[PDB]
């Protein structure tokens, strides 16, 4: 019933921090749908390489925003207990909602 979403710019921190919550939910009495890899939202932009006025030949950058989903079954305060405030991100945004 409990749905958690984890967005992030770094994939290595995401693929690891959203895997901790798979271990911290499985070893507390619940069935956990593993790291669901939602598609990425790549936000590119292309900037002229020079401060002057050399239109041809520039250089572009991208801001990949990754999405990862995980669902746990029963909202028992046994699994809730651990995933309550035992948070270890580096700024990774987490969404917790039940529906």
């Amino acid at each position: 019933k409990i749905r958690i979403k984890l967005r992030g710019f770094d994939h290595k921190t995401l693929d690891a921090s959203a895997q901790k919550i798979v271990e911290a939910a499985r070893r507390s009495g619940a069935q956990v749908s593993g790291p669901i890899p939602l598609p990425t939202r790549v936000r590119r932009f292309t900037v002229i390489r020079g401060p002057f006025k050399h239109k041809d030949s520039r250089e572009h950058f991208e801001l990949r925003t990754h999405n990862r989903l995980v669902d746990i079954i029963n909202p028992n305060r046994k699994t809730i207990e651990q995933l309550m405030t035992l948070d270890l991100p580096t700024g990774v945004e987490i969404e917790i909602k039940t529906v």
Partner: protein, 206 residues
């Protein structure tokens, strides 16, 4: 010439970020401006420390700020000032958790920003630049470096004629990705103008 910033050229693999936080739109713009104003405010009254980095991390009103310094001499024991209101003056336009840490950069002769900054000081001391370059390189090479390279360009020793002094010992492969190459830069302000100091420090990888 034309060569890409050896830091940006890595970023992903080798050399991580310097401001590590995540946000969507309507927030990124505000938090980046604040973030940059922290870097701007710190650099001023903390230059005497000579800061190699200014790492920043966030987590909803958490704002962690790690200041790497060769010699953290300007911290002086708890209530001995140089930290108290100093790490608290940040929250005069922030008001968030101003968690300011201090790191001890062990060898300053292996920190590119510090190397270039030491050189740029010497330019303003009216030192002989070519000899200053040579020494700084060997100094870096003396402290165990796998390769080094310092570059001062323009208006050397005053004198109407922009020059470019060049020195580099050992190995500095900029094209390679598994490089671990530290890059630093510094503005030397002189009574006759402005000149830039590049500093490249290289260690192994694989």
């Amino acid at each position: 010439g034309n060569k890409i910033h050896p830091i940006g050229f890595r970023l992903g693999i080798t050399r991580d970020w310097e401001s590590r936080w995540y946000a969507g739109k309507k927030q990124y713009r505000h938090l980046l401006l604040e973030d940059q104003r922290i870097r701007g405010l710190l650099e001023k009254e903390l230059y005497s420390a000579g800061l190699a980095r200014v790492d920043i991390e966030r987590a909803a009103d958490n704002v962690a700020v790690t200041v790497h310094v060769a010699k953290p001499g300007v911290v002086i024991g708890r209530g001995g000032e140089r930290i108290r209101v100093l790490r608290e003056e940040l929250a005069k336009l922030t008001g968030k958790n101003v968690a300011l840490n201090v790191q001890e950069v062990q060898n300053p002769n292996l920190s590119a920003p510090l190397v270039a900054q030491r050189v740029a000081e010497q330019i303003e001391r009216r030192f002989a630049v070519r000899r200053a370059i040579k020494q700084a390189v060997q100094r870096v090479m003396e402290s165990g470096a796998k390769g080094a390279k310092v570059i001062v360009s323009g208006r050397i020793g005053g004198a109407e004629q922009a020059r470019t002094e060049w020195a580099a010992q050992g190995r500095v492969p900029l094209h390679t990705l598994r490089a671990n190459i530290d890059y630093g830069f510094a503005l030397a302000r002189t009574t006759y103008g402005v000149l830039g100091v590049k500093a490249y420090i290289f260690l192994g990888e694989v």
